[PDB]
Design a protein around this nucleic acid. Structure first.
Ligand SMILES: NC(=O)c1nc(F)cn([C@@H]2O[C@H](COP(=O)(O)OP(=O)(O)OP(=O)(O)O)[C@@H](O)[C@H]2O)c1=O
Ligand SMILES: [Mg+2]
Ligand SMILES: [Mg+2]
Ligand SMILES: [Mg+2]
Ligand SMILES: [Zn+2]
Ligand SMILES: [Zn+2]
Lengths: 67, 114, 911, 28
RNA sequence: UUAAGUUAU
RNA sequence: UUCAUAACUUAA
């Protein structure tokens, strides 16, 4: 279960790469910080709170993915 | 043959950037030297008509490029435009302590010699 | 008892609180530079012949001024009378008072020195050249005594760490003015001795921290005006402290006064030859060896090392804009150009090109290639750049906007992850978990990584110690064949790589190798024997798996630099890679029993063996320029018959201007590289091996010279130590007889297996406990003053039992595994590293089924030894990789990928 | 890019996190 | 010998 | 935009 959040974090940041997220410095800077913290995380308490926060960035701009 | 294509392309590169070389400023620098040999690190400092300043945070902006004009390398520079990390035009009035978190740092400042 | 104190006070009226109880001698630990017929070394001893008297200033508060009484023999007392009388007029001589007190029934001579500080110059040198955290009370006391820092400054954790606490350089620099004043006093003292015809040896322990000298017990009077001061051991031991404390900072100000503003040097000035000569005469007047400000006039490689060491110190005074390529105006086809006709090195002085043509009718392909690689053409046409992100010198901006390249997150392999989870992996409470990922980076990663060069500082080395070390280091490379080769004998591993800036804008390395005939390449190689070709190094981010959030960058040298370096070094480099059983194990395969053979070689004949390993913090960034130049000189020692003295110098100058202090093409902007080593240089791995051996030999030299000679029980070792001091500081010529003896001593007690940066040492444990050979403590001290980094003991390791091999070498662990009928050593990696490679890839194309099966076989080969690990979870890693191979073949000699005896053959002793 | 997007949503539904499920339904 | 891939520094 | 060296595997 702990391996899954880091597993899902890598692909979650990957899908934003070709969504022109890096075109904005503000979004990519904080997205990179969130993604790297999950990989270096050791305790399950804080692992989720970056996971939900980073996914909310994808849902912020609906135009990317048709839910 | 690849012998000629690289020769033509590389010879073109030498001639295509004479815009800022062999100008009035560069001639004066060479003559003052007692042999015409000068360090390379000083040619852009005294001959280039355009200066680029990369400012990482608002604290360094005040101490380096405060106001519409500033001095550097014993010369006076006039600020022309400022852009952010996204290469977007940024107005001068937008730079402030309160508006600093809303700016896409670093900021690149372009100036011209007075 | 009171009468003795009154006589110690003397004519001067100063309160003197006593230190002893009954006016007896005082016992302290002090560092002494000693050389006699019995003991020779620079170590701490027992000083039980002095009776210190602390001075009480107004309000009874203690100050930094002591009164010491030595009370030597009557014969020595009269000898000090004549010498002091001839030297009392010198302001650099501490005041002496001679009196005789009736301690016993009979007359007792006494010698008293007034107003001496608690610690001498040797205490400062020893505290910094033998630094040890925790046991550094002397250094802390000195720092707070002279207001370098507050007493509570040491409460901060890692205050001594250069990387963690860069402010420690500011604290050390506060001692610079005190050290510079000591240098001026020494010159004054030497002049007085020369005028008075006094011959003697100057030592650090005899000079006060105020610069005053007080010991004359070994001086011999001669004809006045012909005195010969000996300052070989004095200056040489003090050299690393000169740049650590930035002693010559005052020379940058007007009239050498720190209060006055900086000197406004002429912006066009680059020679500085006379200024270097004046600096040498002011501080090193009595340094006997000749100093060449420009290394082009040196006599051999040993002279280059000696003169470049002084240039490192003197270059810190001159403006940074005066260094680098030197350019002029030439006329070709009526169109003026700016080209580099010379170079001003911080270490080699001013170098002028010999083959220069002011007027030329046309450019052949050889000179057309040279001009394109010249940074002069690009930098002159660029715009002025002022980058506040980094402290590195900025030259110009070639492009109107700054590049902000980022690092993408790694691609994921869901098929492998599901299979592993289905097989019972990645569960909570398991010793195997993912720790290696493709960490992402933002747009500031490229310039932030380049800013790590700020850890490179101007380091001046102990030249007498260094000159002996290179002789021992050269012995490790005497079993190799080197020399220049023709263009048709050069072997290029891969021609489909980047040719560097600006050549990457037209083709790869294949285009330029095909375009130039063998005559053109040979002509270009001969051109570098007489001229210096500065080049531009491009910086690119490295996209690879890692366990750290650190960004990795790779330096790409131009095709011009790498083409000429291959013709100069490849013969030696190929010889190193093709040799088995040597100290350098580059090119030795770990398969087919190679790992076992490597471990048996390093276990050669050590009687009491322990294993030791270390790593260099910021090795590619904090490497001093003196050691990088030294490494090139060692590699160039194989050109004694194919190159002349001038040819070998220009080759060294070309390397210093291409891979040492070259222009950096980072993000569309040009920067100045302070130093270090370039990753993309053709000799990077081999140059680091020379650097690794030098530090190991230096640690052994320091360990043997810093031990008490009297405490050594072995006659051979004590004689070895005495001759070691004699070779370093008493002989200016190479003693090949002792170099062989010391090299044989190292091979017997300090056998080591060395690759580029990783090193494993099998050392004599008994000798290390007695300080006869280097240990982890000695390596930390050497890296502090000779590398400007702090190596924490947590980053090193020590193994006591040789049944299990080295704990860590080339990211591989070792264990003893039975193979048929005998026990062998098998290298296995971290299971997380193997699992991470399979789970995460750097390209979606690599996710193709055909590519993975070839990719997974290589990973399974590396993961095969894990089956022999006692832990069952570790062993299942290879089984999972094997089982995944079935699924890939299920959906797609062929069967040989499973039945793991195929992987058994990869580690069997027979090939 | 369709394949990458649809496989990522499978992982999110597989995680079964209350906070993760709350926001995805809110955006839906 | 050429190409690709992996690990190693 | 994507360096250097070394070893090994795979396929011609
Ligand atoms: N050009 C390259 O692709 C390249 N790649 C590397 F990994 C290393 N070097 C050179 O070796 C030094 C130490 O390497 P280093 O950082 O110690 O490696 P590492 O982190 O893999 O070692 P370790 O596992 O022992 O910590 C580097 O500073 C550089 O001089 C390279 O040139
Ligand atoms: Mg003494
Ligand atoms: Mg290292
Ligand atoms: Mg290493
Ligand atoms: Zn010399
Ligand atoms: Zn040669």
């Amino acid at each position: 279960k702990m391996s899954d959040v880091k597993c899902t974090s890598v692909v979650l940041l990957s899908v934003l790469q070709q969504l022109r997220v890096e075109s904005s410095s503000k979004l990519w800077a904080q997205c990179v910080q969130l993604h790297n913290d999950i990989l270096l995380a050791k305790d399950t308490t804080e692992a989720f709170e970056k996971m939900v926060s980073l996914l909310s960035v994808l849902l912020s701009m609906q135009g990317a993915v048709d839910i | 043959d690849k012998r000629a294509k690289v020769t033509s392309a590389m010879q073109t590169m030498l001639f295509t950037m004479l815009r800022k070389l062999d100008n009035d400023a560069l001639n004066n620098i060479i003559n003052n030297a007692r042999d015409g040999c000068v360090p390379l690190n000083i040619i852009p400092l005294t001959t280039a008509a355009k200066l680029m300043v990369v400012i990482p945070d608002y604290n360094t902006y005040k101490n380096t490029c405060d106001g519409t004009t500033f001095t550097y390398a014993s010369a006076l520079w006039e600020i022309q435009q400022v852009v952010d990390a996204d290469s977007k035009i940024v107005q001068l009035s937008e730079i402030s302590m309160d508006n600093s978190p809303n700016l896409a740092w670093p900021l690149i400042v372009t100036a011209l010699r007075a | 008892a009171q009468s003795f104190l009154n006589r110690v006070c003397g004519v001067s009226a100063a309160r003197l609180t006593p230190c002893g109880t009954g006016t007896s001698t005082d016992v302290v630990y002090r560092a002494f530079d000693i050389y006699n017929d019995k003991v020779a070394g620079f170590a701490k001893f027992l000083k039980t012949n002095c009776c210190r008297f602390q001075e009480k200033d107004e309000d009874d508060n203690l100050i930094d001024s002591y009164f010491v009484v030595k009370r030597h023999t009557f014969s020595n007392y009269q000898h000090e009378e004549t010498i002091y009388n001839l030297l009392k007029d010198c302001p650099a001589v501490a005041k002496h008072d001679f009196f005789k007190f009736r301690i016993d029934g009979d007359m007792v001579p006494h010698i008293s020195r007034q107003r001496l500080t608690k610690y001498t110059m040797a205490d400062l040198v020893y505290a910094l050249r033998h630094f040890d955290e925790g046991n550094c009370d002397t250094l802390k006391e000195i720092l707070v005594t002279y207001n370098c820092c507050d007493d509570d400054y040491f409460n901060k954790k890692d205050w001594y760490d250069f990387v963690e606490n860069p402010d420690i350089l500011r604290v050390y620099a506060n001692l610079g003015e005190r050290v510079r004043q000591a240098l001026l006093k020494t010159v004054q003292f030497c002049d007085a001795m020369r005028n008075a015809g006094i011959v003697g040896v100057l030592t650090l322990d005899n000079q006060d921290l105020n610069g005053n000298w007080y010991d004359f017990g070994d001086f011999i009077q001669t004809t006045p005006g012909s005195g010969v001061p000996v300052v070989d051991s004095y200056y040489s031991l003090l050299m690393p402290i000169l740049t650590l404390t930035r002693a010559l900072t005052a020379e940058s100000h007007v009239d050498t006064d720190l209060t006055k503003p900086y000197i406004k040097w002429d912006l066009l000035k680059y020679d500085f030859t006379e200024e270097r000569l004046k600096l040498f005469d002011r501080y090193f007047k009595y340094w006997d060896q000749t100093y060449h400000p420009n290394c082009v006039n040196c006599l051999d490689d040993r002279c280059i090392l000696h003169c470049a060491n002084f240039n490192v110190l003197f270059s810190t005074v001159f403006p940074p804009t005066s260094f680098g390529p030197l350019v002029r105006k030439i006329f070709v086809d009526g169109v003026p150009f700016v080209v580099s006709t010379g170079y001003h090195f911080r270490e080699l002085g001013v170098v002028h090109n010999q083959d220069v043509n002011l007027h030329s009718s046309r450019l052949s392909f050889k000179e057309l290639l040279v001009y394109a690689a010249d940074p002069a053409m690009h930098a002159a046409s660029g715009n002025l750049l002022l980058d506040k992100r980094t402290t590195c010198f900025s030259v110009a901006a070639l492009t109107n906007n700054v590049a902000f390249q980022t690092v993408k997150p790694g691609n994921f392999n869901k098929d492998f992850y599901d299979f592993a989870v289905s097989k019972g992996f990645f569960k909570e409470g398991s010793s195997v978990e993912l720790k290696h990922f493709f960490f992402a980076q933002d747009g500031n990663a490229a310039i932030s990584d380049y800013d790590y060069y700020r850890y490179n500082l101007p380091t001046m080395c102990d030249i007498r110690q260094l000159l002996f070390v290179v002789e021992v280091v050269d012995k490790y490379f005497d079993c190799y064949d080197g020399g220049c080769i023709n263009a048709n004998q050069v072997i290029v591993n891969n021609l489909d790589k980047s040719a560097g800036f600006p050549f990457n804008k037209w083709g790869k390395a294949r285009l330029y190798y095909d375009s130039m005939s063998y005559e053109d390449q040979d002509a270009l190689f001969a051109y570098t024997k007489r001229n210096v070709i500065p080049t531009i190094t491009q910086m690119n981010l490295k996209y690879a798996i890692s366990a750290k959030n650190r960004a990795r960058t790779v330096a790409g040298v131009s095709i011009c630099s790498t083409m000429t370096n291959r013709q100069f070094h490849q013969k030696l480099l190929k010889s190193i890679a093709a040799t088995r059983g040597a100290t350098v194990v580059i090119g030795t395969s770990k398969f087919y029993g190679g790992w076992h053979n490597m471990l048996k070689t390093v276990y050669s004949d050590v009687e009491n063996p322990h294993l030791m390993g270390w790593d260099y913090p910021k090795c590619d960034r904090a490497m001093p320029n003196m050691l990088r130049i030294m490494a090139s000189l060692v590699l160039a020692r194989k050109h004694t018959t194919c190159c002349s003295l001038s040819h070998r110098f220009y080759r060294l100058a070309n390397e210093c201007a291409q891979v040492l202090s070259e222009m950096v093409m980072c993000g569309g902007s040009l920067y100045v590289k302070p130093g270090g080593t370039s990753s993309g240089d053709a000799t990077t791995a081999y140059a680091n091996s020379v650097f690794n051996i030098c530090q190991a030999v230096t640690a052994n030299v320091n360990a043997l010279l810093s031990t008490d000679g009297n405490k050594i029980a072995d006659k051979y070792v004590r004689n070895l130590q005495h001759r070691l001091y004699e070779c370093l500081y008493r002989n200016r010529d190479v003693d090949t007889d002792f170099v062989n003896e010391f090299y044989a001593y190292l091979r017997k007690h300090f056998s080591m297996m060395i690759l580029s940066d990783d090193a494993v040492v099998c050392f004599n444990s008994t000798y290390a406990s007695q300080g006869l050979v280097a240990s982890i403590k000695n390596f930390k001290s050497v890296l502090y003053y000779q590398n400007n980094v702090f190596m924490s003991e947590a980053k090193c390791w020590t193994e006591t039992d040789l049944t299990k091999g080295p704990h860590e070498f080339c990211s591989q662990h070792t264990m003893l595994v039975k193979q048929g009928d005998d026990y062998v050593y098998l290298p296995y990696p971290d299971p997380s590293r193997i699992l991470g490679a399979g789970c995460f890839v750097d390209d979606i194309v690599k996710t193709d089924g055909t590519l993975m099966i070839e990719r997974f076989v290589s990973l399974a080969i590396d993961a095969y030894p894990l089956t022999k690990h006692p832990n069952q979870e570790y062993a299942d890693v290879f089984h999972l990789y094997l089982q995944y191979i079935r699924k890939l073949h299920d959906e797609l000699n062929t069967s040989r990928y499973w039945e793991p005896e195929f992987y058994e053959a990869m580690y069997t002793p027979h090939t | 890019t369709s394949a990458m997007q649809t496989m990522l949503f499978t992982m999110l539904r597989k995680l079964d996190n209350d906070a993760l499920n709350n926001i995805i339904n809110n955006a839906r």
